[PDB]
Design a protein around this nucleic acid. Structure first.
Lengths: 123, 134, 199, 78, 80
RNA sequence: GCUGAGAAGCAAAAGGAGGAAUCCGCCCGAGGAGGGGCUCGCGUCUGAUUAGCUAGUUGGUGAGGUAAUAGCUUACCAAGGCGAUGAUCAGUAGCUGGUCCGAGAGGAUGAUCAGCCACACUGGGACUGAGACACGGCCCAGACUCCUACGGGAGGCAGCAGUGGGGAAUUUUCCGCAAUGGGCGAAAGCCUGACGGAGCAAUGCCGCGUGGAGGCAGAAGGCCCACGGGUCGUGAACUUCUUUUCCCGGAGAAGAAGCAAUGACGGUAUCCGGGGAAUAAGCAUCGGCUAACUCUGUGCCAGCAGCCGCGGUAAGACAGAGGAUGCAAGCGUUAUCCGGAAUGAUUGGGCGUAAAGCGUCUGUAGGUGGCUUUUUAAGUCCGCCGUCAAAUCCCAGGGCUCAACCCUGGACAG
């Protein structure tokens, strides 16, 4: 790439920081409607039953979001609040569900790091 | 006789002493004569001699050395071009660089003649930076 | 905040924090376990120079970022100028004049509004003094001789060359900005400066 | 300001000449000196310019949409 | 015309005023040919720059009320 | 004054207040300041899987038209004009002083602050005035809501408050013209949801407190232990000192402008007195990056996770406790942007084998180019001058008890 004419045509441009969440497309976290609350398995090295809610969003997408924590109240057609963040083990799950927010209760009996799970103080 | 008459002399300098040979034969144009005139007096080289071969006046230039070492010259010469043909560079009397604090010089084309940083910093003039050595 | 907390912990961890929170040396009945065995990462060393500085002056760490930004922002040895902007802090001077035994003692002694500066009261411990100032008591403090108790038990260590303590009229003034040799605490400026390079 | 000297392109219009104006310009991000041409319509009631002559453009009252210059002659100091 | 008038330049409950000779149609905090004057009503000075106020009043930019009142404190008024 | 070559013609007025004095006016001119209307150089996003476009189109004249030049418009003549340096089309976008980042070059971006533009339910018109094709003007069409006595009417919150919807999410249907700035008036004054304040919200930036000093090294307890003990821990308990804040009382501003009076804020700010340690610490993390670690339970389960990866019986990675760490009225997660990233490279990369040299060659456009002498100076450099609004950033002072913030002056760059 000489300074003359292969480069005052253009070098090229890198695209963007590609969006790591194609939904949520305004901004960070977005209200959701539960459609399925099924349970899938990770890839080969792990072994678990991870419990994800496939959730329709208010944006216009439908997307399978993970449910953190131990206990979960989430039945059919409830309302959640999804956020970004890639669960590695599950192919397709791109998102999380916030706990302690609207119609998704905090986890049962947790006393270490409660702000990630929406549990008020005991004691 | 290629595209550049200054990468001519300069690349003959680098290729001269990277093979430790203390002798340069180059053409003697006006700007080569001026560069070796402002380069013998700054302690980098030893002598420049004009002569003729087929009535074509050339410069043979003797480089510096020291004594019998692993390499007989300790300080590697490190010549470098700046204002390439096709990308001309130009500086005011502000931008004109003190190379390594001053251990190098930046030979450049004033309206006076071609100077160094000493002889163009006191003038306050600026111009096209040919090349800086260090 | 203040950190207002257990403080021999910080003296055992950071080494002896001089003057601040004690003249009593640490672990009078303690330390009889917990071999370090020599493993300490370098980030722990630079972090302990942060908190060796941050606890010794009682600063909030965000305010210490503020003082580093001003210290870069000034011209000169930023490793020293950081220890000029944190020496001419007011309650460090009231500590250094012996107007209070400890630096929480001086910070509280200036919170409850007991210090006039140039005849005007200063209610804030983070006040930065100037050359040729005037540091006195309150008018009630000739009836409230708490400062005189501190000046009674103080004078083992004398003063560094910015201060001038007048005995009964209780006035202390700083001739000029404190020199590095003058700084009381012993630490490496480069270690702390390097740590904040990242920001 | 300056005039804009430049060659006449084609004068198959009465009182009207197209003029190439060649202008060096530093390209912004990369530091060369790229030429850009820009051709204009100039006015002449004398219409005494053939193809290929070179004139100097000076601003005047706008005569048409494009015809906003009249070109007379350069100085010619060689 | 132009109307020599103050403009609020300060915090809340501060009232540090500039004297600017802007066109009267502008909003009260706009731009001036030359921002000539100062007025600090709490307690401080008032730089005036007499030759420029005489330039604009010599031209005929009438002031407002209290700008005129500041101009009546000092002896600025000469009809030349 | 205008039209016209001249000849010639054509064109204006308004009074009011006051006893007067005089003042505000009016009509015709001529300047200036400021404000607009135009024109032009240069800068102004991506896409060639959009290659031709343009016929009032680009010129010329004549006739008109505009405040003014103009295809602004019309008749006729000429065939021009733009474009592979991206025309035309499609898509996106208010723009700039600036903000944020970056060492730097520059990358992204245009909230509040400020200047210019455009719009005012969606479209289209014109009217008056100096000035509009006018947000709260008029007329028409379209859609929509309200009233109707059924014939008809009325309406434009993208003004301030507010309701409803959408949304993860953004407030009070507040006080005042006291200042400041508008509009009108000779003055008095009037009106200003501009503006000046107030209320709610840790939304951000800054400052401050939750105690200071001593505390026998004796006890009660949690956790861990080679059962010796260690560690919570001077920590607490406990003794004194103090009152920033808190409560209970008193006083009490400037802001307001030399005729006096004139305050929504507000009896707010600030000060004085009387109790009283009283009223006040959480949230992440502790496998490596990355500072902080052991124990109990679980047994590829529950789960965690930023990447690597932990989890199949003793887990420094899950869950709990203790302890520690870092922060602090905040602490974390997420999203967006820059850095790191020399991972789009001018500063600053590569092409034998790692991604990459066209199969080779001719050559157009274009790019770069031998030596000497002379000339102009377009580039280049130097001086001076103009400008790049103010605010911001940088330096130095000054003011708020400091800081944040505000203010005064100055300037390199470019």
């Amino acid at each position: 790439m000489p300074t003359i004419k292969q480069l005052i045509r253009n070098t090229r441009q890198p695209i963007r920081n590609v969006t790591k969440s194609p939904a949520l497309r305004g901004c960070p976290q977005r209200r959701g409607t539960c459609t399925r609350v099924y349970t899938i398995t990770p890839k080969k090295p792990n072994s678990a039953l991870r419990k994800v809610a496939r959730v329709r969003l208010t944006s216009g997408f439908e997307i399978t979001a993970y449910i953190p924590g131990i206990g979960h109240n989430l039945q059919e057609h409830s309302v959640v609040l999804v956020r970004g963040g890639r669960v590695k083990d599950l192919p397709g799950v791109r998102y999380h569900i916030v706990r302690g927010t609207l119609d998704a209760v905090g986890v049962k009996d947790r006393q270490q790091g409660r702000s990630k799970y929406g549990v008020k103080k005991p004691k | 006789m290629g595209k550049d008459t200054i990468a001519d002399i300069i690349t003959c300098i680098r290729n001269a002493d990277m093979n430790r040979k203390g002798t340069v034969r180059i053409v003697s144009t006006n700007i080569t004569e001026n560069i070796v005139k402002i380069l013998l007096r700054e302690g980098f080289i030893e002598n420049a001699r004009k002569h003729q071969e087929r009535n074509k006046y050339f410069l043979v230039l003797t480089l510096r050395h020291r004594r019998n070492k692993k390499g007989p010259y300790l300080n590697t010469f490190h010549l470098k071009r700046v204002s390439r043909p096709g990308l001309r560079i130009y500086s005011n009397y502000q931008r004109i660089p003190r190379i390594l604090g001053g251990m190098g010089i930046a030979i450049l084309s004033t309206s006076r003649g071609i100077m160094t940083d000493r002889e163009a910093r006191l003038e306050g003039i600026g111009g096209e930076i040919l090349c800086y050595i260090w | 905040s203040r950190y207002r907390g257990p403080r021999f912990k910080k003296i055992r961890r950071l080494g002896a924090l001089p003057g601040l929170t004690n003249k009593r040396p640490r672990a009078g009945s303690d330390l009889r376990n917990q071999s370090r065995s020599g493993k300490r990462s370098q980030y722990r060393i630079r972090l302990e120079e942060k908190q060796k500085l941050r606890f010794h002056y009682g600063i909030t760490e965000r305010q210490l970022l503020k003082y580093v930004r001003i210290a870069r922002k000034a011209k000169g040895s930023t490793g020293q100028v950081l220890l000029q902007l944190l020496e001419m802090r007011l309650d460090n001077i009231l500590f250094r004049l012996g107007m209070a035994p400890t630096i929480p003692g001086a910070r509280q002694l200036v919170n409850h509004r007991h210090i006039l500066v140039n005849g005007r009261i200063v209610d804030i411990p983070s006040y930065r003094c100037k050359p040729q100032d005037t540091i006195m008591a309150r008018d009630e403090q000739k009836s409230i001789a708490l400062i005189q108790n501190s000046l009674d038990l103080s004078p083992r260590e004398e003063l560094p060359k910015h201060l001038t303590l007048n005995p009964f009229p209780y006035k202390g003034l700083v001739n000029q900005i404190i020199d590095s040799k003058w700084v009381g605490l012993k630490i490496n400026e480069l270690l702390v400066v390097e740590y904040y390079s990242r920001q | 300001m300056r005039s804009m000297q430049g060659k006449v392109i084609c004068a198959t219009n009465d009182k009207t000449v197209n003029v190439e104006v060649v202008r060096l310009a530093p390209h912004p991000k990369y530091k060369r000196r790229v030429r850009k041409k820009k051709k204009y319509q100039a006015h002449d009631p004398d219409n005494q310019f053939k193809v290929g002559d070179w004139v100097q453009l000076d601003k005047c009252r706008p005569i048409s949409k494009t015809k906003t210059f009249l070109a007379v002659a350069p100085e010619g100091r060689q | 015309m132009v109307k020599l008038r103050l403009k609020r330049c300060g915090r809340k409950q501060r009232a540090v005023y500039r004297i600017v000779a802007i066109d009267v149609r502008s909003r009260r905090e706009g731009r001036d040919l030359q921002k000539v004057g100062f007025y600090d009503p709490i307690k401080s000075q008032t730089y005036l720059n007499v030759p420029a106020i005489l330039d604009f009043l010599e031209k005929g930019a009438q002031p407002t009320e209290t700008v005129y009142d500041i101009l009546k404190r000092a002896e600025v008024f000469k009809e030349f």
